[PDB]
Symmetry: C2
Subunit: 391 residues, 2 copies
């Protein structure tokens, strides 16, 4: 061919993460949030929010927004106010900044020159600009000017799966390709003051946090590179009877989510079939039936923690051992819902805990695993993973 292809499976060769420096402990967030938005007098609504925070599964989050910025930009503190211009101004610089920070850590781990990066996949649901955040990152890092970019704006919470699905084909179909994959998510586009008329917004204020994660992906690893996971199969599903379950509109008041169905119920009702169909396709239909794991407790799990009820209902319906959701719940606890970045943070946490506890593989000692993104559609993104053996 005029462009050669790679031989082996796309492999994760490094993972780096970054967060803003301002930490918000969840136990004191209702006070902070109702104070800074001049809403301290809304006693009933504040109690409702306190209960939301107490039930969130979150201990702390990191956010770029803090008191000084919010005081200087009162349209962000209002409960429903035209404010997109300010939100855009913040997002168009902070999203690639946080992405740069994560990327530098990934590249340092990887240990290869940044000039060897041939492709970039950048994902965010925080703002849009032309050129996009992919271009900004390319400039900030000094990547080769011929880097081949895939800019994925406004997809929401499932896109941690999406970027891996997309990057798999890039890595596998291009000999020598090394793909930088970045998810960077920040809450400046959704932050607003509290009101009873915008309760979906209020739920987001209990859950969403800031973070970026960067992966180096490539097929046919060099001896100097260090695999930690392989991508082996990907799929997408729009779940039945889920129209309008999660909508998000970018308006002059900022990004506004509207949820209209029982998201945990829909996900947990259908996830068994999603997984059976995925593993049947990956193993049975490819002539590798013998290698198919015997149950969902015999694989490792990386699930998007959109809220704790999703995790709880999936665990119950699928009869998961109590440890299956542990790595996922740890990231929810320590960072909150960072949208697309969560599953990459969880992947990093899992490989690090597996090494720390002297397990046999990067996937909690198990060979195969599933990574799941959940978001608007209602879309489930599924990626089947293989672990890498540890000393």
């Amino acid at each position: 061919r005029l462009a050669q292809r790679a031989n082996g499976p796309a492999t994760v060769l490094a993972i780096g993460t970054a967060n803003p420096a301002n930490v918000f402990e969840q136990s004191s967030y209702p006070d902070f949030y109702f104070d800074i938005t001049n809403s301290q007098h809304m006693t009933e609504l504040k109690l409702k929010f306190s209960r939301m925070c107490q039930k969130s599964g979150i201990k702390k989050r990191y956010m770029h927004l803090n008191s000084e910025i919010l005081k200087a930009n009162p349209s962000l503190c209002a409960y429903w106010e035209k404010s997109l211009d300010v939100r855009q101004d913040i997002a168009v610089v902070e999203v690639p900044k946080l992405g740069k920070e994560a990327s530098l850590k990934a590249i340092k781990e990887w240990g290869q020159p940044k000039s060897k990066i041939t492709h970039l996949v950048f994902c965010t649901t925080s703002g849009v600009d032309m050129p996009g955040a992919d271009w900004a990152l390319t400039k900030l890092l000094g990547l080769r000017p011929s880097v081949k970019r895939l800019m994925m704006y406004q997809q929401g919470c499932f896109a941690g799966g999406t970027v891996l699905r997309v990057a798999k084909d890039v890595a596998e179909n291009n000999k020598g390709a090394r793909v930088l994959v970045v998810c960077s998510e920040i809450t400046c586009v959704t932050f607003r003051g509290p009101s009873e008329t915008h309760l979906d917004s209020l739920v987001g204020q209990a859950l969403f946090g800031d973070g970026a994660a960067a992966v180096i992906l490539g097929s046919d690893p060099l001896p100097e590179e260090n695999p930690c996971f392989e991508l082996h199969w990907s799929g997408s599903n729009i779940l039945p009877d889920s129209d309008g379950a999660i909508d998000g509109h970018l308006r002059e008041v900022g990004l506004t989510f509207h949820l209209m169905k029982d998201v945990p119920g829909i996900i947990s009702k259908n996830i068994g079939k999603v997984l059976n169909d995925a593993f049947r396709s990956a193993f049975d239909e490819s002539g590798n039936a013998e290698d198919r794991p015997a149950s969902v407790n015999d694989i490792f799990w990386i699930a998007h923690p959109g809220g704790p009820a999703i995790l709880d209902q999936v665990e119950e319906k699928m009869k998961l051992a109590p440890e299956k959701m542990r790595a996922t719940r740890d990231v929810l606890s320590e960072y909150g819902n960072m949208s697309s970045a969560c599953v990459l943070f969880i992947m990093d946490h899992m490989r690090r805990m597996s090494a720390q506890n002297k397990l046999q593989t990067t996937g909690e000692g198990l060979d195969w695993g599933v990574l799941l993104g959940f978001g608007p559609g209602l879309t489930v993104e599924t990626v089947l993973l293989k672990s890498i053996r540890l000393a």
Copy 2:
């Protein structure tokens, strides 16, 4: 790797196009535009705009916006009024609708059941929403609910190249994959009234039009399918010294472009090296030096017609024969600048004219060609195409 890959090059198997029903003749557009925006008193600015339209290379455009919609939505007619909410309301419906019309035509040509579409790549710079226009189109067409989607928002005018670059890997790395690739672009996010204080906006009012194009792409064509082009190589380049050349910001007043450098100058100064490096990589560095075309006049050309000066200056600097740009200029003339969709309309026009005129291949009788997208960066997207031989 638990998932089989395809063997041959990604192949275009069908192309369908659509446009809104309202036709705007360019000769009368200054009149329409200054009338509907209540700017008739701006006689000097109208004279300027008339000259812009006379120099645009455009005979007509199609737009969803019309007098009825603009009268119903006066914030669109003002020169700088907050109006993004209205623009979004229009775009989130019209973008997938136009994409559906184009896709149905592509699928009819293709002749296979729509259930065989495994992947969807959807590209627009007109609005954003969650779920996206990809999801909306999936619902409108009744595609399989397990369709694997790649939603590309807000990239601008180079993205006709981008979607082919991206879809190439999808089709080639997945045995049996059939990819619906859709570019759907409309002017409701950029339309605004005239001002001496927003001339970049005014150039866009002379050039941008509405349209969607849909391509079916797949490797290893079946006997019942009909190849018309193959994708063989792709590249991207951020051109030197081009920061700020084309910026676009989505604001409460809608989408606003700001051009801070000489776009035709930058593209024409650098395109020789882009093309030389592309053909060197594709042929020489892959062990196929002997099949590399001898000159730029020995390949067919599909260039994004961002404006007529880009085409003129590339033609001059590259010493192209006068008809190399004809297919491109024809689409600019008949439809205007439909952003990412243009190069796909040009691909369709080229295969159709080649057949009509009984030429030996779909690429004006030539074997190899280049497709070029131009946009913010300044980014050039390059795709190297092989034509398909015709029977006559």
